[PDB]
C-alpha cells in the first residue's frame, strides 16, 4: 500500500512573554518519529519510535539544526504577517506549516506537498505540479510573488521528489516490523435499550493501525447516515487506533440493520448484525 | 529527514 | 576527511573531456556545489546540483547520485583556460557548514 | 550587483602590528564567513556569521577577532600579527534563511605576509 512521511511544525506568539512557542512533529504514516519542543529540557530533536533511534549523532546534529531554523523562521513570520494584517502587538497568533510525501507500493513518488496557514486559515500552499502557488489573498500575494522570484518551488521540488522520497524508504525498511505492519480491527457489537420504544446499535472497531477505517450502517443494502453517529478515530495511545459508529433504532428491527467494516487488515469488508 | 532550505515569509 | 575528492593533476589536451569526482560523507546532504578557483584568485561557482542525475549548462555537466554519494562534473570540449585547481562543495542545510574538498588541479594542454 | 568586495587585495606586516580585514556584501544575506587557504591543507573555517549581530567561532579562530553589527559588513581583525598568519583570506557569504539558491559566493581575497 500507499505510505506517506509528513512534517508537521508550529509556532504560537505569546506578546508580553517573550519568544513564541515552537513545537514540531515528524510522522511516518500515523507514528510519530521525531519531536522538537521549544519548552522541552534537551533543546535537541528527539525520537519517538524505536526504529529511529539506531540514527549516529550526525543525524541528530543536523536535525536539531534544521529544526532550529525553522524555528528561527517561524519567530520571523510572525511579525512578517502581523505588519502584513496590521494586527497589534496584544495578540497571541499562529503559524502552521507542513510538507512531505507521498510514495505508492512500488515505493516510487507519487505525490508532495508543503502548505502553510496564518492564524489556521489558508495562507500558501504549493500546488500539486511543485511549480506554482496558491496563495489565499492579498497579503499572500506578496509572498508568492516573492517566493516565485527567489525559486523557492525549485528547492522545494528536489526535496519533495528527491530526499523525502529517499528517506522514507530508509524509514520504513528500517521499521519493517513497526511500520510495515497491518492489524485488523477487533469487533465488539452492544445494544442498550434507550427508552422502550427505542434503542441504540453500537458498532465498535479497535486495536487497528493504520488509522484509516470505514464503519457505515445500513438497512436492506442502502446506507443511513441520517440516523448515523460517527466518532472521531482516536488513538488508544499503544501505536493503534479505536473508532465507534452508531444508530438510533426502533427495536424489533436490529436484524435488517447491518454495519460495514473496512479496513487494510480485513481480506474480507466484514458485516456485523446484533446477535 | 527534515527539508534544509527553510525561508521566510 | 568530510569531502574526498580526486588526487591530481590531471592532465587532459584540448577538445577532449577532464572528469571530475567527490565523495562525501553524510547521507542527509542537500546541496552541491563544484568551484572553480584559477591560481592566484577566488574559488568561482560553476555549477549547483540539487537532485540525482545530470544537470547541464553549457560545457558542463554534473552529476549526482545521493546512493553512492558521489558527486561528479564532466568537462566537454575543453579550452586551455579551463586550466585551474575545481573543488566540490557539499551541504545538509541554510545552516550547516559548507564542507570543501581538497580540490582537484586540472591542466589542459595545448 | 557587487556581489562580495573585500578590501586590500595585498598586505605586509611586521610581527605584532594590527590589521582589519574589510568585507562586505550586496545581497541581503545573513551568513557570511571568513576563511584561509593555504598550500597543504585548503580552504579552512576561522569565524562565521549567521546572522547580524551575532557570530561564533571556525575551525581556526585562534589570533583572530570578527564582529557584524550590521547586516553588510563582516570585519575580520588580527590583533596582533603572527608570521603564520600569513596566507590567502578569503571572505564568503550566503542567504542563511533570507533568500533563493543556497550558493555561497566569495570575495576576491587578501593576501598577507607577516615577517619577523
Known amino acids: 500500500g500507499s505510505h506517506s512521511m509528513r512534517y508537521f511544525f508550529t509556532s504560537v506568539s505569546r506578546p508580553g512573554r517573550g519568544e513564541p512557542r515552537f513545537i514540531a512533529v515528524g510522522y511516518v504514516d500515523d507514528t510519530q518519529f521525531v519531536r522538537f519542543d521549544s519548552d522541552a529540557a534537551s533543546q535537541r530533536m528527539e525520537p519517538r519510535a524505536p526504529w529511529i533511534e539506531q540514527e549516529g549523532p550526525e543525524y541528530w546534529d543536523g536535525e536539531t539544526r534544521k529544526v532550529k531554523a525553522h524555528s528561527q523562521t517561524h519567530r520571523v513570520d510572525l511579525g512578517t504577517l502581523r505588519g502584513y494584517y496590521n494586527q497589534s502587538e496584544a495578540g497571541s497568533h499562529t503559524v502552521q506549516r507542513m510538507y512531505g510525501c507521498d510514495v505508492g507500493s512500488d515505493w516510487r513518488f507519487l505525490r508532495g506537498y508543503h502548505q502553510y496557514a496564518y492564524d489556521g486559515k489558508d495562507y500558501i500552499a504549493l500546488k500539486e505540479d511543485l511549480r506554482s502557488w496558491t496563495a489565499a489573498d492579498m497579503a499572500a500575494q506578496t509572498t508568492k510573488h516573492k517566493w516565485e522570484a527567489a525559486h523557492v518551488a525549485e528547492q522545494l521540488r528536489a526535496y519533495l521528489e528527491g530526499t523525502c522520497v529517499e528517506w522514507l524508504r530508509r524509514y520504513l525498511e528500517n521499521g519493517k516490523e513497526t511500520l510495515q505492519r497491518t492489524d485488523a480491527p477487533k469487533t465488539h457489537m452492544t445494544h442498550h435499550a434507550v427508552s422502550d420504544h427505542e434503542a441504540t446499535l453500537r458498532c465498535w472497531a479497535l486495536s487497528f493501525y493504520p488509522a484509516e477505517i470505514t464503519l457505515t450502517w445500513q438497512r436492506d443494502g442502502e446506507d443511513q447516515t441520517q440516523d448515523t453517529e460517527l466518532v472521531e478515530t482516536r488513538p488508544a495511545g499503544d501505536g493503534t487506533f479505536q473508532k465507534w459508529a452508531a444508530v438510533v433504532v426502533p427495536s424489533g428491527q436490529e436484524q435488517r440493520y447491518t454495519c460495514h467494516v473496512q479496513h487494510e487488515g480485513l481480506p474480507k469488508p466484514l458485516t456485523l448484525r446484533w446477535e | 529527514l527534515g527539508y534544509g532550505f527553510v525561508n521566510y515569509i | 576527511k568530510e569531502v574526498e575528492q580526486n588526487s591530481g593533476p590531471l592532465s587532459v589536451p584540448e577538445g577532449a573531456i577532464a572528469s571530475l569526482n567527490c565523495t562525501y560523507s553524510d547521507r542527509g546532504s542537500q546541496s552541491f556545489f563544484w568551484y572553480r578557483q584559477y591560481s592566484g584568485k577566488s574559488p568561482e561557482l560553476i555549477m549547483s546540483?540539487?537532485?540525482?542525475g545530470d544537470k547541464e549548462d553549457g560545457r558542463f555537466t554534473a552529476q549526482l547520485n545521493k546512493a553512492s554519494q558521489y558527486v561528479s562534473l564532466l568537462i566537454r570540449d575543453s579550452q586551455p583556460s579551463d586550466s585551474a585547481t575545481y573543488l566540490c562543495a557539499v551541504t545538509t542545510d541554510s545552516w550547516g557548514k559548507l564542507q570543501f574538498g581538497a580540490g582537484t588541479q586540472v591542466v589542459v594542454t595545448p | 550587483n557587487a556581489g562580495v568586495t573585500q578590501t586590500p587585495k595585498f598586505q605586509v606586516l611586521k610581527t605584532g602590528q594590527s590589521m582589519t580585514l574589510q568585507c562586505a556584501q550586496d545581497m541581503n544575506h545573513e551568513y557570511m564567513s571568513w576563511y584561509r587557504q593555504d598550500p597543504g591543507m585548503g580552504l579552512r573555517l576561522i569565524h562565521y556569521?549567521?546572522?547580524?549581530?551575532?557570530?561564533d567561532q571556525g575551525e581556526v579562530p585562534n589570533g583572530y577577532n570578527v564582529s557584524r553589527s550590521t547586516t553588510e559588513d563582516f570585519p575580520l581583525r588580527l590583533l596582533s600579527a603572527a608570521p603564520s598568519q600569513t596566507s590567502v583570506y578569503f571572505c564568503?557569504?550566503?542567504?542563511?534563511?533570507?533568500?533563493?539558491?543556497?550558493?555561497?559566493?566569495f570575495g576576491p581575497g587578501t593576501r598577507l605576509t607577516v615577517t619577523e
Open positions: 546540483i540539487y537532485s540525482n
Open positions: 564568503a557569504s550566503r542567504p542563511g534563511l533570507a533568500g533563493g539558491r543556497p550558493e555561497q559566493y
Open positions: 556569521s549567521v546572522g547580524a549581530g551575532i557570530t
